[PDB]
């Protein structure tokens, strides 16, 4: 109900999306963000899932891209889904326990700062080290931004972050779908589609297996 | 005032304002304002689609007399696969029809170019975009609009006749015209069939029931062959 | 006003301000079992207990059954887990059921006494100092203290919605267990197996094809 | 004033000509009460609409059967479809009962409380289930052409045409059942036999209708 960009020009978008949240396009046909508290929680959930999917898509695409060139290292020919049954320096259970404890610590710190902004901006061991007073949930800053990149156009940068996060989330969902249907790595499907795009489509692949 | 029946009283919902208004509505399907507004766009889209299709069929037969238009979707080979062509056509047609539909329900809302902010369609009516869609307009606007709706109605009836003649005789429009001019007293539909209380004979459907397109057996049946006279 | 039947006459007893305060009020009472406010309160407690019990049971049946289909676990069927669990156990089923009945009777008796008199379990000098924490909140069937350790019931704005996710889900669980029983007496296999068999051919594998749920067909 | 089913007989009080196709035909006074007449009006409209669909389908299938198209008769179409296509009969019955149950239940509760279905409890749709009159459910879903919301005289004429065509279709379906039980063939086969010889091929010569013949 404003002049901000929309996902459907002319459509009557809901009134609870006023543009305050980053990447607001008024897309909510199910009206899941009607409740202000639910929307406040969904914003943080979307941001965390976005950054995690960004790291996931980057960690899926970079090793396969580096394996196809002269660059070599121990785990190169292994697929992203086949990395679990790999011979490491420690069993997966021990690593799972270690990461669960570390993630529990950082996630509890983030949750504490989420229920009360600025309540967790102090380093527990060194009292001198701290985060700036001006902070919002989901945007830590301080040591998390050592180069001061947020000091510039934060709105455009936040829009870039949310858009890249949505794109990465869709890409990861596509990775799962392609792995469950084709049963091959994503870059292989990309090259297969690039060789002949007219006969390498989702409709053709699914019709052949029907 | 021109009408579809000289000396007849036109319906109350038709006052001769819209282009091509000849007071023809025995069922009164255009009595409602919203229904008439939607049907106007439907008729315009039907008119343009039928005109393009009739011109395509005529040029296809004149340039290629050995390729049947009814078989045009069957005996045409292209490097682009049929599934890829269908995907491209579905996406492009979906995009343009969504823009047109949004302009119908919300006028002056999708007239802006998304890629470039400097291009924008000028204010217009519903069903008549204009601007980039109308680079040259030789003649009066209302006169050309009436000519457009009349040519569209003729083209719609022409496409229906094309389909029926291709299903009954299996020949194209030019071939059917030449065959009819050769023996006009025996090549009309009245000569091909007749119905009486003791007998009901109909011409056979020249189109095969099934078409083997890459081993799929696409059914190609004659439109309401059982109801054929 | 949300209703279980648009246009149906909502009962007058379900339209009172106290009856509308309950979670999941959809005006469903064709038999009029909630006309009496005392009966309605008792049945509301019964529905809450059934919802939580059904949710725990259906979860303990569905999740290990879904993990058994994959390689995560090897839990047997819910209708056969009792025999397998009692085979290599440390006590027979009778002794275990006796201890169970004793332990469950104590807490159910305390819950019954709190239902009869709200907050009565906080009698001084009766539970070695833990009696203070045994007093529930203002609403019957929603206690605090030892229960709810995370303290998610302190935020009222979501409280009214939280309860809606507890009753509705529980109601679904109550039907789920019912299906688990009916399917057991109709196909002879587990619930996950019935779901997979139905997904394989939904147009020919259902309750209208087993010959048990439709004997006239 | 208006024509009646029996000329010279005064029309009853419960039939004043306000309803479509009102000819004052009620010798048993089954619709004397207002609520009972309302229920019977909706029942007659539903019966006529179903009879119209059935008569049209039976006539079209018999047309395809008379010509060399392989269409089965209406009294064998169920067996032909169930045996030709791998379709489970009880499953189809249950699906049909589910869809009809939902539609007829919404219609029933709308009859009990007019305009109740327009509250928006069904996917948010409100004006599509508001209803116009008894047995005439106007809206954009049931009447997308908007013929019930324009030209009142034309609407009343269409209402009269609908009730008359419905009664004719009901009589047609009864005739289909009697013709199949007496002659054993389809309706168009009976029509062809009658057109071939109308003086000797009729109900007075089938040997079943008139037992003393």
PDB file of N, CA and C in Angstrom, chain B residues 76-149:
ATOM      1  N   UNK B  76       6.504 -31.280 -38.821  1.00  0.00           N
ATOM      2  CA  UNK B  76       7.499 -30.214 -38.734  1.00  0.00           C
ATOM      3  C   UNK B  76       8.579 -30.647 -37.757  1.00  0.00           C
ATOM      4  N   UNK B  77       9.815 -30.707 -38.245  1.00  0.00           N
ATOM      5  CA  UNK B  77      10.971 -31.105 -37.457  1.00  0.00           C
ATOM      6  C   UNK B  77      11.841 -29.882 -37.211  1.00  0.00           C
ATOM      7  N   UNK B  78      12.287 -29.714 -35.972  1.00  0.00           N
ATOM      8  CA  UNK B  78      13.125 -28.596 -35.575  1.00  0.00           C
ATOM      9  C   UNK B  78      14.159 -29.061 -34.562  1.00  0.00           C
ATOM     10  N   UNK B  79      15.355 -28.451 -34.556  1.00  0.00           N
ATOM     11  CA  UNK B  79      16.383 -28.856 -33.579  1.00  0.00           C
ATOM     12  C   UNK B  79      15.945 -28.641 -32.144  1.00  0.00           C
ATOM     13  N   UNK B  80      15.085 -27.657 -31.914  1.00  0.00           N
ATOM     14  CA  UNK B  80      14.551 -27.388 -30.592  1.00  0.00           C
ATOM     15  C   UNK B  80      13.511 -28.463 -30.308  1.00  0.00           C
ATOM     16  N   UNK B  81      13.676 -29.183 -29.202  1.00  0.00           N
ATOM     17  CA  UNK B  81      12.764 -30.245 -28.846  1.00  0.00           C
ATOM     18  C   UNK B  81      11.365 -29.745 -28.553  1.00  0.00           C
ATOM     19  N   UNK B  82      10.359 -30.611 -28.737  1.00  0.00           N
ATOM     20  CA  UNK B  82       8.969 -30.192 -28.466  1.00  0.00           C
ATOM     21  C   UNK B  82       8.736 -29.783 -27.023  1.00  0.00           C
ATOM     22  N   UNK B  83       9.413 -30.438 -26.076  1.00  0.00           N
ATOM     23  CA  UNK B  83       9.255 -30.078 -24.672  1.00  0.00           C
ATOM     24  C   UNK B  83       9.906 -28.729 -24.390  1.00  0.00           C
ATOM     25  N   UNK B  84      11.063 -28.467 -25.006  1.00  0.00           N
ATOM     26  CA  UNK B  84      11.715 -27.180 -24.824  1.00  0.00           C
ATOM     27  C   UNK B  84      10.909 -26.058 -25.450  1.00  0.00           C
ATOM     28  N   UNK B  85      10.328 -26.324 -26.625  1.00  0.00           N
ATOM     29  CA  UNK B  85       9.491 -25.334 -27.293  1.00  0.00           C
ATOM     30  C   UNK B  85       8.250 -25.046 -26.467  1.00  0.00           C
ATOM     31  N   UNK B  86       7.666 -26.095 -25.877  1.00  0.00           N
ATOM     32  CA  UNK B  86       6.488 -25.915 -25.040  1.00  0.00           C
ATOM     33  C   UNK B  86       6.825 -25.113 -23.791  1.00  0.00           C
ATOM     34  N   UNK B  87       7.998 -25.360 -23.197  1.00  0.00           N
ATOM     35  CA  UNK B  87       8.396 -24.608 -22.008  1.00  0.00           C
ATOM     36  C   UNK B  87       8.606 -23.133 -22.334  1.00  0.00           C
ATOM     37  N   UNK B  88       9.286 -22.850 -23.452  1.00  0.00           N
ATOM     38  CA  UNK B  88       9.517 -21.467 -23.866  1.00  0.00           C
ATOM     39  C   UNK B  88       8.191 -20.765 -24.134  1.00  0.00           C
ATOM     40  N   UNK B  89       7.309 -21.426 -24.893  1.00  0.00           N
ATOM     41  CA  UNK B  89       6.017 -20.844 -25.229  1.00  0.00           C
ATOM     42  C   UNK B  89       5.160 -20.624 -23.992  1.00  0.00           C
ATOM     43  N   UNK B  90       5.160 -21.585 -23.068  1.00  0.00           N
ATOM     44  CA  UNK B  90       4.369 -21.452 -21.852  1.00  0.00           C
ATOM     45  C   UNK B  90       4.860 -20.293 -21.001  1.00  0.00           C
ATOM     46  N   UNK B  91       6.178 -20.145 -20.857  1.00  0.00           N
ATOM     47  CA  UNK B  91       6.693 -19.057 -20.030  1.00  0.00           C
ATOM     48  C   UNK B  91       6.420 -17.689 -20.654  1.00  0.00           C
ATOM     49  N   UNK B  92       6.694 -17.534 -21.955  1.00  0.00           N
ATOM     50  CA  UNK B  92       6.463 -16.241 -22.599  1.00  0.00           C
ATOM     51  C   UNK B  92       4.973 -15.891 -22.636  1.00  0.00           C
ATOM     52  N   UNK B  93       4.127 -16.860 -23.010  1.00  0.00           N
ATOM     53  CA  UNK B  93       2.692 -16.614 -23.065  1.00  0.00           C
ATOM     54  C   UNK B  93       2.134 -16.346 -21.678  1.00  0.00           C
ATOM     55  N   UNK B  94       2.644 -17.045 -20.662  1.00  0.00           N
ATOM     56  CA  UNK B  94       2.181 -16.826 -19.302  1.00  0.00           C
ATOM     57  C   UNK B  94       2.519 -15.418 -18.846  1.00  0.00           C
ATOM     58  N   UNK B  95       3.732 -14.954 -19.160  1.00  0.00           N
ATOM     59  CA  UNK B  95       4.144 -13.606 -18.780  1.00  0.00           C
ATOM     60  C   UNK B  95       3.263 -12.542 -19.433  1.00  0.00           C
ATOM     61  N   UNK B  96       3.065 -12.638 -20.753  1.00  0.00           N
ATOM     62  CA  UNK B  96       2.267 -11.620 -21.444  1.00  0.00           C
ATOM     63  C   UNK B  96       0.795 -11.677 -21.036  1.00  0.00           C
ATOM     64  N   UNK B  97       0.244 -12.880 -20.822  1.00  0.00           N
ATOM     65  CA  UNK B  97      -1.161 -12.960 -20.436  1.00  0.00           C
ATOM     66  C   UNK B  97      -1.354 -12.472 -19.010  1.00  0.00           C
ATOM     67  N   UNK B  98      -0.341 -12.638 -18.150  1.00  0.00           N
ATOM     68  CA  UNK B  98      -0.445 -12.127 -16.788  1.00  0.00           C
ATOM     69  C   UNK B  98      -0.434 -10.604 -16.811  1.00  0.00           C
ATOM     70  N   UNK B  99       0.425 -10.013 -17.650  1.00  0.00           N
ATOM     71  CA  UNK B  99       0.453  -8.553 -17.758  1.00  0.00           C
ATOM     72  C   UNK B  99      -0.877  -8.016 -18.290  1.00  0.00           C
ATOM     73  N   UNK B 100      -1.434  -8.673 -19.315  1.00  0.00           N
ATOM     74  CA  UNK B 100      -2.714  -8.245 -19.878  1.00  0.00           C
ATOM     75  C   UNK B 100      -3.849  -8.386 -18.866  1.00  0.00           C
ATOM     76  N   UNK B 101      -3.879  -9.503 -18.137  1.00  0.00           N
ATOM     77  CA  UNK B 101      -4.925  -9.731 -17.146  1.00  0.00           C
ATOM     78  C   UNK B 101      -4.843  -8.718 -16.014  1.00  0.00           C
ATOM     79  N   UNK B 102      -3.623  -8.384 -15.583  1.00  0.00           N
ATOM     80  CA  UNK B 102      -3.472  -7.403 -14.518  1.00  0.00           C
ATOM     81  C   UNK B 102      -3.922  -6.032 -14.993  1.00  0.00           C
ATOM     82  N   UNK B 103      -3.686  -5.718 -16.271  1.00  0.00           N
ATOM     83  CA  UNK B 103      -4.155  -4.436 -16.783  1.00  0.00           C
ATOM     84  C   UNK B 103      -5.676  -4.428 -16.869  1.00  0.00           C
ATOM     85  N   UNK B 104      -6.273  -5.594 -17.119  1.00  0.00           N
ATOM     86  CA  UNK B 104      -7.729  -5.673 -17.179  1.00  0.00           C
ATOM     87  C   UNK B 104      -8.336  -5.418 -15.805  1.00  0.00           C
ATOM     88  N   UNK B 105      -7.850  -6.129 -14.786  1.00  0.00           N
ATOM     89  CA  UNK B 105      -8.420  -5.951 -13.455  1.00  0.00           C
ATOM     90  C   UNK B 105      -7.975  -4.650 -12.800  1.00  0.00           C
ATOM     91  N   UNK B 106      -6.768  -4.171 -13.101  1.00  0.00           N
ATOM     92  CA  UNK B 106      -6.236  -2.935 -12.523  1.00  0.00           C
ATOM     93  C   UNK B 106      -5.642  -2.086 -13.639  1.00  0.00           C
ATOM     94  N   UNK B 107      -6.454  -1.245 -14.282  1.00  0.00           N
ATOM     95  CA  UNK B 107      -5.948  -0.415 -15.386  1.00  0.00           C
ATOM     96  C   UNK B 107      -4.889   0.582 -14.940  1.00  0.00           C
ATOM     97  N   UNK B 108      -3.904   0.790 -15.810  1.00  0.00           N
ATOM     98  CA  UNK B 108      -2.817   1.714 -15.526  1.00  0.00           C
ATOM     99  C   UNK B 108      -1.924   1.267 -14.393  1.00  0.00           C
ATOM    100  N   UNK B 109      -1.695  -0.040 -14.274  1.00  0.00           N
ATOM    101  CA  UNK B 109      -0.861  -0.588 -13.216  1.00  0.00           C
ATOM    102  C   UNK B 109       0.337  -1.384 -13.707  1.00  0.00           C
ATOM    103  N   UNK B 110       0.326  -1.890 -14.939  1.00  0.00           N
ATOM    104  CA  UNK B 110       1.451  -2.650 -15.478  1.00  0.00           C
ATOM    105  C   UNK B 110       1.968  -2.001 -16.753  1.00  0.00           C
ATOM    106  N   UNK B 111       1.671  -0.715 -16.937  1.00  0.00           N
ATOM    107  CA  UNK B 111       2.123   0.008 -18.119  1.00  0.00           C
ATOM    108  C   UNK B 111       3.583   0.431 -18.036  1.00  0.00           C
ATOM    109  N   UNK B 112       4.264   0.127 -16.934  1.00  0.00           N
ATOM    110  CA  UNK B 112       5.657   0.503 -16.729  1.00  0.00           C
ATOM    111  C   UNK B 112       6.613  -0.631 -17.088  1.00  0.00           C
ATOM    112  N   UNK B 113       7.726  -0.267 -17.721  1.00  0.00           N
ATOM    113  CA  UNK B 113       8.759  -1.224 -18.108  1.00  0.00           C
ATOM    114  C   UNK B 113       9.578  -1.569 -16.869  1.00  0.00           C
ATOM    115  N   UNK B 114       9.693  -2.845 -16.490  1.00  0.00           N
ATOM    116  CA  UNK B 114      10.465  -3.180 -15.281  1.00  0.00           C
ATOM    117  C   UNK B 114      11.971  -3.049 -15.432  1.00  0.00           C
ATOM    118  N   UNK B 115      12.538  -3.408 -16.578  1.00  0.00           N
ATOM    119  CA  UNK B 115      13.983  -3.323 -16.772  1.00  0.00           C
ATOM    120  C   UNK B 115      14.462  -1.880 -16.824  1.00  0.00           C
ATOM    121  N   UNK B 116      13.758  -1.025 -17.560  1.00  0.00           N
ATOM    122  CA  UNK B 116      14.124   0.377 -17.730  1.00  0.00           C
ATOM    123  C   UNK B 116      13.002   1.259 -17.199  1.00  0.00           C
ATOM    124  N   UNK B 117      13.340   2.160 -16.278  1.00  0.00           N
ATOM    125  CA  UNK B 117      12.355   3.044 -15.664  1.00  0.00           C
ATOM    126  C   UNK B 117      11.938   4.220 -16.537  1.00  0.00           C
ATOM    127  N   UNK B 118      12.581   4.445 -17.677  1.00  0.00           N
ATOM    128  CA  UNK B 118      12.208   5.572 -18.519  1.00  0.00           C
ATOM    129  C   UNK B 118      11.109   5.242 -19.523  1.00  0.00           C
ATOM    130  N   UNK B 119      10.880   3.969 -19.825  1.00  0.00           N
ATOM    131  CA  UNK B 119       9.852   3.564 -20.773  1.00  0.00           C
ATOM    132  C   UNK B 119       8.556   3.303 -20.022  1.00  0.00           C
ATOM    133  N   UNK B 120       7.457   3.850 -20.536  1.00  0.00           N
ATOM    134  CA  UNK B 120       6.150   3.688 -19.918  1.00  0.00           C
ATOM    135  C   UNK B 120       5.073   3.918 -20.963  1.00  0.00           C
ATOM    136  N   UNK B 121       4.071   3.048 -20.968  1.00  0.00           N
ATOM    137  CA  UNK B 121       2.978   3.183 -21.917  1.00  0.00           C
ATOM    138  C   UNK B 121       2.127   4.399 -21.560  1.00  0.00           C
ATOM    139  N   UNK B 122       1.669   5.161 -22.548  1.00  0.00           N
ATOM    140  CA  UNK B 122       0.829   6.330 -22.265  1.00  0.00           C
ATOM    141  C   UNK B 122      -0.544   5.883 -21.800  1.00  0.00           C
ATOM    142  N   UNK B 123      -1.337   6.767 -21.180  1.00  0.00           N
ATOM    143  CA  UNK B 123      -2.680   6.365 -20.735  1.00  0.00           C
ATOM    144  C   UNK B 123      -3.545   5.937 -21.915  1.00  0.00           C
ATOM    145  N   UNK B 124      -4.277   4.846 -21.725  1.00  0.00           N
ATOM    146  CA  UNK B 124      -5.111   4.289 -22.780  1.00  0.00           C
ATOM    147  C   UNK B 124      -6.324   3.608 -22.165  1.00  0.00           C
ATOM    148  N   UNK B 125      -7.073   2.903 -23.005  1.00  0.00           N
ATOM    149  CA  UNK B 125      -8.256   2.165 -22.600  1.00  0.00           C
ATOM    150  C   UNK B 125      -7.869   0.731 -22.271  1.00  0.00           C
ATOM    151  N   UNK B 126      -8.877  -0.076 -21.933  1.00  0.00           N
ATOM    152  CA  UNK B 126      -8.618  -1.475 -21.622  1.00  0.00           C
ATOM    153  C   UNK B 126      -8.831  -2.296 -22.883  1.00  0.00           C
ATOM    154  N   UNK B 127      -7.804  -3.048 -23.268  1.00  0.00           N
ATOM    155  CA  UNK B 127      -7.837  -3.838 -24.472  1.00  0.00           C
ATOM    156  C   UNK B 127      -7.175  -3.164 -25.647  1.00  0.00           C
ATOM    157  N   UNK B 128      -6.812  -1.891 -25.502  1.00  0.00           N
ATOM    158  CA  UNK B 128      -6.141  -1.109 -26.539  1.00  0.00           C
ATOM    159  C   UNK B 128      -4.906  -0.492 -25.901  1.00  0.00           C
ATOM    160  N   UNK B 129      -3.792  -1.243 -25.841  1.00  0.00           N
ATOM    161  CA  UNK B 129      -2.558  -0.739 -25.210  1.00  0.00           C
ATOM    162  C   UNK B 129      -1.982   0.530 -25.813  1.00  0.00           C
ATOM    163  N   UNK B 130      -1.663   0.506 -27.102  1.00  0.00           N
ATOM    164  CA  UNK B 130      -1.108   1.700 -27.702  1.00  0.00           C
ATOM    165  C   UNK B 130       0.339   1.938 -27.296  1.00  0.00           C
ATOM    166  N   UNK B 131       0.846   3.092 -27.708  1.00  0.00           N
ATOM    167  CA  UNK B 131       2.219   3.446 -27.391  1.00  0.00           C
ATOM    168  C   UNK B 131       3.178   2.666 -28.262  1.00  0.00           C
ATOM    169  N   UNK B 132       3.963   1.786 -27.635  1.00  0.00           N
ATOM    170  CA  UNK B 132       4.919   0.981 -28.388  1.00  0.00           C
ATOM    171  C   UNK B 132       4.189  -0.078 -29.211  1.00  0.00           C
ATOM    172  N   UNK B 133       2.989  -0.467 -28.791  1.00  0.00           N
ATOM    173  CA  UNK B 133       2.210  -1.459 -29.515  1.00  0.00           C
ATOM    174  C   UNK B 133       1.536  -0.883 -30.749  1.00  0.00           C
ATOM    175  N   UNK B 134       1.491   0.443 -30.881  1.00  0.00           N
ATOM    176  CA  UNK B 134       0.861   1.113 -32.018  1.00  0.00           C
ATOM    177  C   UNK B 134       1.806   2.158 -32.598  1.00  0.00           C
ATOM    178  N   UNK B 135       2.839   1.736 -33.336  1.00  0.00           N
ATOM    179  CA  UNK B 135       3.768   2.729 -33.905  1.00  0.00           C
ATOM    180  C   UNK B 135       3.181   3.541 -35.051  1.00  0.00           C
ATOM    181  N   UNK B 136       2.350   2.942 -35.904  1.00  0.00           N
ATOM    182  CA  UNK B 136       1.750   3.660 -37.022  1.00  0.00           C
ATOM    183  C   UNK B 136       0.245   3.439 -36.996  1.00  0.00           C
ATOM    184  N   UNK B 137      -0.519   4.527 -37.080  1.00  0.00           N
ATOM    185  CA  UNK B 137      -1.981   4.472 -37.057  1.00  0.00           C
ATOM    186  C   UNK B 137      -2.518   5.240 -38.264  1.00  0.00           C
ATOM    187  N   UNK B 138      -2.583   4.639 -39.458  1.00  0.00           N
ATOM    188  CA  UNK B 138      -3.089   5.364 -40.636  1.00  0.00           C
ATOM    189  C   UNK B 138      -4.610   5.375 -40.702  1.00  0.00           C
ATOM    190  N   UNK B 139      -5.198   6.527 -40.419  1.00  0.00           N
ATOM    191  CA  UNK B 139      -6.638   6.682 -40.454  1.00  0.00           C
ATOM    192  C   UNK B 139      -7.211   7.038 -39.093  1.00  0.00           C
ATOM    193  N   UNK B 140      -8.540   7.129 -39.074  1.00  0.00           N
ATOM    194  CA  UNK B 140      -9.265   7.466 -37.857  1.00  0.00           C
ATOM    195  C   UNK B 140      -9.183   6.322 -36.852  1.00  0.00           C
ATOM    196  N   UNK B 141      -9.112   6.685 -35.569  1.00  0.00           N
ATOM    197  CA  UNK B 141      -9.016   5.678 -34.517  1.00  0.00           C
ATOM    198  C   UNK B 141     -10.294   4.859 -34.391  1.00  0.00           C
ATOM    199  N   UNK B 142     -11.452   5.524 -34.327  1.00  0.00           N
ATOM    200  CA  UNK B 142     -12.719   4.806 -34.203  1.00  0.00           C
ATOM    201  C   UNK B 142     -13.015   3.982 -35.452  1.00  0.00           C
ATOM    202  N   UNK B 143     -12.737   4.544 -36.631  1.00  0.00           N
ATOM    203  CA  UNK B 143     -12.962   3.820 -37.878  1.00  0.00           C
ATOM    204  C   UNK B 143     -12.096   2.569 -37.946  1.00  0.00           C
ATOM    205  N   UNK B 144     -10.815   2.697 -37.585  1.00  0.00           N
ATOM    206  CA  UNK B 144      -9.918   1.549 -37.595  1.00  0.00           C
ATOM    207  C   UNK B 144     -10.321   0.532 -36.535  1.00  0.00           C
ATOM    208  N   UNK B 145     -10.871   0.997 -35.407  1.00  0.00           N
ATOM    209  CA  UNK B 145     -11.319   0.075 -34.365  1.00  0.00           C
ATOM    210  C   UNK B 145     -12.496  -0.757 -34.855  1.00  0.00           C
ATOM    211  N   UNK B 146     -13.426  -0.113 -35.569  1.00  0.00           N
ATOM    212  CA  UNK B 146     -14.575  -0.820 -36.127  1.00  0.00           C
ATOM    213  C   UNK B 146     -14.103  -1.818 -37.177  1.00  0.00           C
ATOM    214  N   UNK B 147     -13.134  -1.406 -38.003  1.00  0.00           N
ATOM    215  CA  UNK B 147     -12.587  -2.298 -39.023  1.00  0.00           C
ATOM    216  C   UNK B 147     -11.909  -3.498 -38.379  1.00  0.00           C
ATOM    217  N   UNK B 148     -11.227  -3.267 -37.258  1.00  0.00           N
ATOM    218  CA  UNK B 148     -10.545  -4.337 -36.542  1.00  0.00           C
ATOM    219  C   UNK B 148     -11.527  -5.351 -35.975  1.00  0.00           C
ATOM    220  N   UNK B 149     -12.603  -4.879 -35.342  1.00  0.00           N
ATOM    221  CA  UNK B 149     -13.563  -5.822 -34.769  1.00  0.00           C
ATOM    222  C   UNK B 149     -14.325  -6.572 -35.868  1.00  0.00           C
TER     223      UNK B 149
END
